Amino acid sequence: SVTVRPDWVTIEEMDFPRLSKLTLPGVKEGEDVLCCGAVEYYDKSYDRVNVKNEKPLQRIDRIFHTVTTTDDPVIRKLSKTEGNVYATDAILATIMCCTRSNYSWDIVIEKIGNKLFFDKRDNTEFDLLTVNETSVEPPQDDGNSLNSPRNLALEATFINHNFSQQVLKSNEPRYKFDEPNPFIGEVASVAYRYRKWDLNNGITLIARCEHDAVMQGTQFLTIKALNEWDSKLANGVEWRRKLDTQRGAVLANELRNNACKLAKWTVQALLAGSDQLKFGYVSRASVRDSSKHVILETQQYKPNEFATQINLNMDNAWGILRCIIDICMNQKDGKYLIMKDPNKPMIRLYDIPDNT
């Protein structure tokens, strides 16, 4: 995801066997420090979509933000009086689920005094979803193919942006938090909870979490879209043939072949305190066209129950994060980089030039 240079210094190597044994039990729910933005209500007619009653995926005319930690004006303001470690839900999810990751990724860490800022680099593949990343044989096609890893990633990301907004009541008033969105109908429906965690050892985490919508049971939702590109080429189970009759097998296949993507979504919901994880199932209209899609159905899971299904253990998630925090706190001020080795089960912490 980024080219290592000769002037980079390896601070520490963290292999997945070691990281999998970490545990930090007893971490409570995050405490809201500030809430802002406003979400639209979920459209429950989408719960009645099924394979025999498919719904075309619409193109939604909205801008989809991904603002990193140090560019967030709420985080900058809150940091004057709150916490000593700062990040976003998506950045934390990447770290917390690193032992499930296969494809390379990176996160920038800046230490300033006794404070840590975890950032992501914009317009990279950090903000793109992966497709069949954890299959025995991940997608192998080359550049131009619509089934290459990168084109599959662009497709799934586009699907997810459109789906999250389509299933909402767009011409109705929103559920408003106390403060306005710090970044701006022209924008994706989203509401933010800036939340605080006591991680012990003098560590207090402040991080931006989010909900995609609200729903009348008021329940807050994390909304994501699972996607099917070509089930035969993926060696999967065909959703149009199996969703109604073997729903458990369809999901089990998603758990194993998209393991990191689904775990990070679940962490996002757990951190924000979403009451429901809502999963759309979106498939191509035809297998050689990545421009047209249909919603085959929606499913709903309590995040804590889904975490159990996927063996997501938040004691380990927090343990991994505090391990990396503790190492960074022992370093001098400056810019650092953590990145997953493309070919090995490990992440490395580098000292990188502050101009990089």
- The 3-state secondary structure of the chain reads CCCCCCCCEEEEEEEHHHHHCCCCCCCCCCEEEEEEEEECEECHHHHHCECCECEECCCCCCECCCCCHHHCHHHHHHCCCCCCEEEEHHHHHHHHCHHHCCCCCEEEEEEECCEEEEECCCCCHHHCCCCCCCCCCCCCCCCCCCCCHHHHHHHHHHHHHHHHHHCECCCCCCEECCECCCCCCCECCEEEEEEEEECCCCCEEEEEEEECEEECCCEEEEEEEEEECCHHHHCCCCHHHHCCCCHHHHHHHHHHHCHHHHHHHHHHHHHHCCCEEEEEEEEEEECCEEEEEEEEEEEEECHHHHHHHCCCCHHHHHHHHHHHHHHHHCCCCEEEEEEECCCCCEEEEEECCCCC
Minimal CA–CA distance to 278: which of 209, 238, 220, 208?
Answer: 220
Q: Are 325 and 93 in contact (CB under 8 A)?
A: no
* Distance in angstroms (rounded) separating the CA atoms of residues 256 and 22: 23
**Residues 168/191, Cβ–Cβ less than 8 Å:** no
221 contacts 205 by C-beta, under 8 angstroms: no
Beta bridge partners of 119: 108
Residues 174, 187: Cα–Cα separation, whole Å: 13
The pairs formed by 228-234 with CB atoms below 8 angstroms and a separation of 24 or more are: 228/281, 228/282, 228/283, 228/284, 228/296, 229/131, 229/147, 229/152, 229/155, 229/283, 229/284, 229/287, 229/290, 230/147, 230/284, 230/287, 232/287, 233/147, 233/287, 234/132, 234/135, 234/139
Q: Are strands 85-88 and 334-340 parallel, antiparallel or unpaired?
A: unpaired
Q: What are the distances in angstroms from CA 344 to CA 102, 153, 221, 227, 347?
A: 8, 22, 35, 27, 8
d(CA 218, CA 318) in angstroms, rounded, equals 28
Q: Is 247 exposed, middle or buried (0-12, 13-18, 19+ CB in 10 A)?
A: middle
Residue among 21, 133, 34 at smallest CA distance from 79: 34
- C-alpha to C-alpha distances, 72 to 42, 68, 208, nearest whole angstrom: 27, 6, 9
Give the span between the Cα atoms of 251 and 239, in whole angstroms.
10
Nearest to 115 by CA among 235, 234, 20, 202: 202
Resolution in Å, one decimal place: 2.0
Backbone angles phi, psi at 96, to 5 degrees: -65, -25
287 to 45, 81, 283, 343: CA distances (angstroms):
27, 53, 9, 30
Structure solved via: X-ray
Q: What's the residue count for the chain?
A: 356
Strands 9-15 and 115-119: unpaired
